């Protein structure tokens, strides 16, 4: 019962599915960082997705790293309606 | 079934069309053909011409 999110529903117009866009493993081992990077554009009724990851190794919670990297698109979207408001999700099950 | 042609039931499936200008997601298909090389062609590439 995790869709805490939303709890009412309506008519629905787009159900895409694929991969995952955080594809990184942590199980490999500890030690170093993901960077997940993400470029949200709503032009002429259409949205584009870009994401890159690399690792940092030391987590310094200060700045973000000295490097450039390119941003490849993932997904482009179709749908066409107006957006002006962001808001973002978080995990969270409960006090441990 | 003992009733006339023109009483006779017929399935009707009617489809509307509607040119919503943002979207633009669905719609049929396009045929493509034989791919050449060393030849001076006219080539049409996902909309490249
Ligand atoms: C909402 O979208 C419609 C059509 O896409 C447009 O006419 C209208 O100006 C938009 N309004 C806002 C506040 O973006």
Same mark, same amino acid.
């Given at each position: 019962?995790? %869709? $805490?999110?939303?709890?009412?529903? !309506? /008519?629905?117009? %787009?159900?895409? =599915?694929?991969?995952?866009?955080?594809?990184?493993?942590? *199980? #490999?081992?500890?030690?170093? #960082? /993901?960077? +997940?990077? %993400?470029?949200?554009?709503? @032009?002429?009724?259409?949205?584009?997705?870009?994401?890159?990851? &690399?690792?940092? @190794? =030391? $987590?310094?919670?200060?700045?973000?790293?000295?490097?450039?990297?390119?941003?490849?698109?993932? =997904?482009?979207?179709?749908?066409?309606? /107006? @957006?002006? $408001? %962001?808001? &973002?999700?978080?995990?969270?099950? +409960?006090?441990? | 079934?003992?009733?006339?042609? *023109?009483?006779?039931?017929? +399935?009707? =499936?009617?489809?509307?069309?509607?040119?919503?200008?943002?979207?633009?997601?669905?719609? *049929?298909?396009?045929?493509? &053909? /034989?791919?050449?090389?060393? #030849?001076?062609? !006219?080539?049409?590439? !996902? *909309?490249? #011409?």
């Amino acid at each position: 019962s995790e %869709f $805490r999110v939303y709890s009412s529903a !309506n /008519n629905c117009t %787009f159900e895409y =599915v694929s991969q995952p866009f955080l594809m990184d493993l942590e *199980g #490999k081992q500890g030690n170093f #960082k /993901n960077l +997940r990077e %993400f470029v949200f554009k709503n @032009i002429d009724g259409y949205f584009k997705i870009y994401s890159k990851h &690399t690792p940092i @190794i =030391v $987590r310094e919670p200060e700045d973000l790293p000295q490097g450039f990297s390119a941003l490849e698109p993932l =997904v482009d979207l179709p749908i066409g309606i /107006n @957006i002006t $408001r %962001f808001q &973002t999700l978080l995990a969270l099950h +409960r006090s441990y | 079934p003992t009733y006339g042609v *023109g009483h006779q039931p017929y +399935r009707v =499936v009617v489809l509307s069309f509607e040119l919503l200008h943002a979207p633009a997601t669905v719609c *049929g298909p396009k045929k493509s &053909t /034989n791919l050449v090389k060393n #030849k001076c062609v !006219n080539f049409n590439f !996902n *909309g490249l #011409k």
